[PDB]
Amino acid sequence: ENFPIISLDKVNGVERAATMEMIKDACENWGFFELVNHGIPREVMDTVEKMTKGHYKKCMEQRFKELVASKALEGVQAEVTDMDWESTFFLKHLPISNISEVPDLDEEYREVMRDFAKRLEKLAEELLDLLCENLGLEKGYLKNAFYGSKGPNFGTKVSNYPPCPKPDLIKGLRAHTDAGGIILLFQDDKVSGLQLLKDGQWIDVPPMRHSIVVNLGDQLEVITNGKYKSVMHRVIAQKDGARMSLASFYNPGSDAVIYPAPALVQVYPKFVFDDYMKLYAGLKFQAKEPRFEAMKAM
Amino acid sequence: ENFPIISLDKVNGVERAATMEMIKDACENWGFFELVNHGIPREVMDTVEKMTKGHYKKCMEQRFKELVASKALEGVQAEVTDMDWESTFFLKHLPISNISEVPDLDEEYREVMRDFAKRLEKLAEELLDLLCENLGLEKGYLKNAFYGSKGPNFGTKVSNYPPCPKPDLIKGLRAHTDAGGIILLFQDDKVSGLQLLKDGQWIDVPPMRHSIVVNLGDQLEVITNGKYKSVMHRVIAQKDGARMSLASFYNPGSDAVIYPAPALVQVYPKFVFDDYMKLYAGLKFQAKEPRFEAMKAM
Amino acid sequence: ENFPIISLDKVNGVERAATMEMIKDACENWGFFELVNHGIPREVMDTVEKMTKGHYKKCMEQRFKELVASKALEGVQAEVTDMDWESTFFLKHLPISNISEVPDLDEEYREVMRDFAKRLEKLAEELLDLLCENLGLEKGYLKNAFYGSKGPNFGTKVSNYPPCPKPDLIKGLRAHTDAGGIILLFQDDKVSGLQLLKDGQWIDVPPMRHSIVVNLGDQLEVITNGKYKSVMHRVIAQKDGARMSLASFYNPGSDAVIYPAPALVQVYPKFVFDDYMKLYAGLKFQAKEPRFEAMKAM
Amino acid sequence: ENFPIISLDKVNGVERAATMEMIKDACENWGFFELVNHGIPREVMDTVEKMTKGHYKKCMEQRFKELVASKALEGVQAEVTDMDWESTFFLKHLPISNISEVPDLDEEYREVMRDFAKRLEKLAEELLDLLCENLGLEKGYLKNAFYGSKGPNFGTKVSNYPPCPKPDLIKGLRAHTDAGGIILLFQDDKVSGLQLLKDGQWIDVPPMRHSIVVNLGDQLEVITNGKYKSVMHRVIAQKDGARMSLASFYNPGSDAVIYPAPALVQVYPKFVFDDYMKLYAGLKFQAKEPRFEAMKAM
């Protein structure tokens, strides 16, 4: 039925009508959609890509130096094949940007990301609004829902990785859905290795240049009372290309209260986003009582 | 009201009547009780203590060697105050003893623990039976309940630690109850630093020589439909003495099905012990559906 | 001038004369040589390859399970691209085989490696003898030199790795020579990614099927008073193939005394192999005196 | 013969004569000396102590939270006796203060340390000058010797630790000398647990309130051509008191060139301080050639 690839700028022209419905359709039947002409200068994306990869290589050169020294201590000879090429770090943008405080980063690099973080936040809120429109909600409803008190939690995960040694290794690998609100993914190359589960079958995200892959989390499923479901996915390092990935998450504020939009209404539960994340980090059952309640439910 | 200290061998004499009731009382109003004349030769306990501490010192000497080498690599000077004196490892006894396969242990040491593991299993099952008797259940009911299919999970946690640098550090330290069945704790010296919460207040476990501190877990609370509750506790390294601790856990088998004894009957839930431990290791919510159910409950 | 690829079985025929000289030439002008028809049943190699890769995949499946759980704790979502695909463990064969005690290994796997370890030890000693012959030394001279008192240290490093994310990352990566005696390397596929430095330039080891790449360490350079020099190398995971590697090291015994064969004689130093390895693990300068001597030398 | 305890302010009075000679004597026959009335306001020391301990407790509360969560994942119950109470971090002051960039520190705390770092640098340079005077060198000779090009390396190691579980554990624990220039140690309580080796026997550093323990490194031994030797020491956490320690090191600049003062002149070697530290971090023998030279020396 074809993965929805969408040109954002068309929501400013005569085709808006058709474009707005690709979004609606993608939202209800895919949980994902790939964006192009999304507004982020191909200039900025390239600069973000070149600088990220640079920081990475510097970390790796330093990582091998340490590896050799550490291995020697144990009378072992460190080879390059002993290297751990995986490296990931996060950047908080909202409600508080720790970008100025993240370790070993160039100031020119910090400013690039400071700006990218701002452009993505803007793109995130436009998409949220276009969703409201397709949903029949007032403008900024979702942005408001996510506000809580201090505002929404926007951050970026920056990963660098080698390819998976052999595809068969990704066999029993569990899949999942994102617990947050809306996710904006930016990758290098054309082929990500990202796949979503549609109708019990795995579907590849079409390789596009300078695209931003967008996907909905569990919070939007609750807020839409099921209209838009969060889909299961997995990214698998392709010997092909994609070896860098910047996954930015735009989630509700810690204290935000999630519940199906009254107008959008079985019914979904109401709750503080934070309880949902604690139900996640298993911090909800270190107590006897809850456990006894959990078992009583089943 | 005084912490119950009990002499096990008295269940073989005229005083059995009174001793059996200290157990009943301890079970319903303390969740804990300290044992003496429990049947384990003061000989065996001492030998277990001397050998454990020996293994520990050897590990520590090796740990400092590594520390100096590791620190030097970073152009740092390792001092003895940089040492990590905490060391803990487990030994599985039932249903399968990995004692013959636990790393860096003397064979003479492995056999001491093999024997101690057997004596404790025996002590564990006698206590379970005395509990049945006080509970009005048939002999071996609890042992049977814990059997599952392959049998109960009996293992020993062996810890060695320095004292807490300053008591005030143990301020906001969360307390807890044991999720398993019955716990048998063996320590060195006289003062453990172990405390239980009785009536909103912290109570110290009386310092006894060669005692075995016994405490009930959540599983026995379920099986007894509340008659015996699992109490909250914490052990705090005393500058005083106790620096070694062997906590042996006698828990239901993985697949065992727990539920209030029909004769012992709000009502407690029925369930596989394994689901309870997964509800523990937070492996129960990596899926969207469950999360939505959890939030719906609250 | 072409990398020396050699067929061992020809040392049993009329061509022995020419084969023996490929070895001589490889020993003096390459420090490396690739072996085929070396005596290890293509059967054994394949079985060793299939079982190693199997153990690896099992470890990886378990590693991702842990990754997801660990990441969730920090409210992070573990993706497959977050995986660390590198895994290496050692097996001691001589003078004492810990193969029966290496963690999480199939017994059928342990026996395969027990046998492979024996075949390689045999191949290692034949090569040592052929070297003696080309060197003009008595048979078993080198094997004897390596004996020390308890015998030589033979072990196997078993590594599994993904490919290097991008070749340019292997830029400033230091190269090195092996400090031991003789090294026997067995890999999967055809292309290893292994390179040696010949005349200031990097040379690839020819891709061969079921070959055993052999290379000399510093100890043989000393023993030969320079006749045979230990060459600098590096292995770089190829997107191509090689993703498994079993590097077996046949080094002198701990207490062995190394020195240029009297008949093979600037002159090389005499010393206990162990001091050489401690000069390696930097355990030789944690003392003031030595440091002052070291600086005085320079 | 009594450990030299010295009152610095007396170098400003009639007793200067006698005080200056306690320093001379301490320098030649102890390698250590304890300071009081050293110029750092008892006010500043207390504030530095109260704030350090506060940061520590916060880290520990957070460390136990993580411990419980991590242990639960493995179906293990984290007890307080499982805690790792040791925590150490460094602060660079010279030539570049990373104090403004050290993680999780209060700004009020960063400023306290910024000021303490300045007071200690001043105390460090006065002592260096008093040493010059006793040595017959011009004022600032040593400070100059340590300057290199960018200046000397001054930093502070901040450690917090529990007491050693049992004194006997500190048996075979290697001792050492400091490779740097001059060390200024500040501790809490009265009893440090610090000992120096004098005449083959261990000597305790006298417990003093608000003292600064000063000790000379290998660099000053070189610069003095043996006149002042760097002594072997070790600090052992006392169940008694000292549980906090701030060891500030005032070492020569990276590129500084060390050698016996011409006027102070077997003879000691000349060298760049950095080569001495690399001879330390074993980064000097990952190359074959050097190794062969090292073995040739012995």
From Swiss-Prot, chains A, B, C, D:
Gene3D superfamilies according to UniProt: B-lactam Antibiotic, Isopenicillin N Synthase, Chain
Top-rank taxon, per record: Eukaryota
Catalytic activity annotation: 1-aminocyclopropane-1-carboxylate + L-ascorbate + O2 = ethene + L-dehydroascorbate + hydrogen cyanide + CO2 + 2 H2O
Pathway in which this enzyme or protein is active: Alkene biosynthesis; ethylene biosynthesis via S-adenosyl-L-methionine; ethylene from S-adenosyl-L-methionine: step 2/2
UniProt keyword annotation of Lipid biosynthesis present: no
Protein's UniProt keywords contain Iron: yes
GO terms for biological process, alphabetical: coumarin biosynthetic process; ethylene biosynthetic process; response to molecule of fungal origin
Example GO molecular function: 2-oxoglutarate-dependent dioxygenase activity
Record key words, sorted: Ethylene biosynthesis, Iron, Metal-binding, Oxidoreductase, Vitamin C
UniProt cofactor(s): Fe cation
Residues annotated for Fe cation binding in this entry: 176, 178, 233
Xref: SUPFAM superfamilies: Clavaminate synthase-like
A Pfam family recorded for this sequence: 2OG-FeII_Oxy
Ranges of residues in domain Fe2OG dioxygenase: 152-252
Record-listed E.C. numbers: 1.14.17.4
Cross-referenced InterPro entries: DIOX_N, IPNS-like_FE2OG_OXY, IPNS-like_sf, Oxoglu/Fe-dep_dioxygenase_dom, Plant_2OG-oxidoreductases
PANTHER family attached to this UniProt entry: OXOGLUTARATE/IRON-DEPENDENT DIOXYGENASE
Entry similarity comment: Belongs to the iron/ascorbate-dependent oxidoreductase family.
Protein name, entry field: 1-aminocyclopropane-1-carboxylate oxidase 1
Originating organism: Petunia hybrida
Lineage: Eukaryota, Viridiplantae, Streptophyta, Embryophyta, Tracheophyta
Gene expressing this chain: ACO1
